[PDB]
């Protein structure tokens, strides 16, 4: 039904929000510290000097294990 | 249709996977460091000396800003 189409769209949007903001292909699993923005996969987070969201200096990257992985 | 019911169940499970595994009421937004398990809200994470997934000591809690928030 039309309701099935609405639910498919909600699911698709939530799943897309879990993907890396740089490559759009891999799941987010890395946090820039200390700011806390968690928006990249490990590969894309590895060479950024500053956060792509807030511009804060990246002191290090913390790996995150999420139940949605 | 029956697919509407199946999609409602998938969406409910994905949403539940984003809620704190301890209180079940607030969104996950905290990482136990250094292990990286990101399973709690800030209120539950502040009360745990050991990670509830792996039992490693919590040295500190890192707040995470996720695009799904
Ligand atoms: Zn990436
Ligand atoms: Zn940031
Ligand atoms: Zn909680
Ligand atoms: Zn742990």
From Swiss-Prot, chains A, B:
Record PTM text: Autoubiquitinated.
Induction annotation: Expression is directly activated by NR1H2 and NR1H3. Expression is not dependent of the sterol-response element-binding proteins (SREBPs). Expression is indirectly induced by LDL.
Tissue specificity comment: Ubiquitously expressed.
Function: E3 ubiquitin-protein ligase that mediates ubiquitination and subsequent proteasomal degradation of myosin regulatory light chain (MRLC), LDLR, VLDLR and LRP8. Activity depends on E2 enzymes of the UBE2D family. Proteasomal degradation of MRLC leads to inhibit neurite outgrowth in presence of NGF by counteracting the stabilization of MRLC by saposin-like protein (CNPY2/MSAP) and reducing CNPY2-stimulated neurite outgrowth. Acts as a sterol-dependent inhibitor of cellular cholesterol uptake by mediating ubiquitination and subsequent degradation of LDLR.
Comment on protein domains: The RING domain mediates ubiquitination and the neurite outgrowth inhibitory activity.
Summary of subunit composition and partner proteins: Homodimer. Interacts with the E2 ubiquitin-conjugating enzyme, UBE2D1 (via RING-type zinc finger). Interacts with myosin regulatory light chain (MRLC) and TMEM4.
Protein name as it appears in the record: E3 ubiquitin-protein ligase MYLIP
Ranges annotated as RING-type zinc finger: 20-55
Region (Critical for homodimerization): 64-66
Effect of residue 20 to A: Abolishes ubiquitin ligase activity
Taxonomic lineage: Eukaryota, Metazoa, Chordata, Craniata, Vertebrata
Protein localization: Cytoplasm; Cell membrane
Superkingdom, taxonomy of origin: Eukaryota
Range within the parent protein: 369 to 436 of 445
């Amino acid at each position: 039904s039309q309701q099935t189409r609405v639910l498919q769209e909600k699911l698709r949007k939530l799943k897309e929000a879990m993907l890396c903001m740089v490559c759009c292909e891999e799941e987010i699993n890395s946090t820039f510290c200390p700011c806390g923005h968690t928006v990249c996969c490990e590969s894309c987070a590895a060479q950024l000097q500053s956060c792509p969201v807030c511009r804060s200096r990246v002191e290090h990257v913390q790996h995150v294990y999420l139940p949605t992985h």
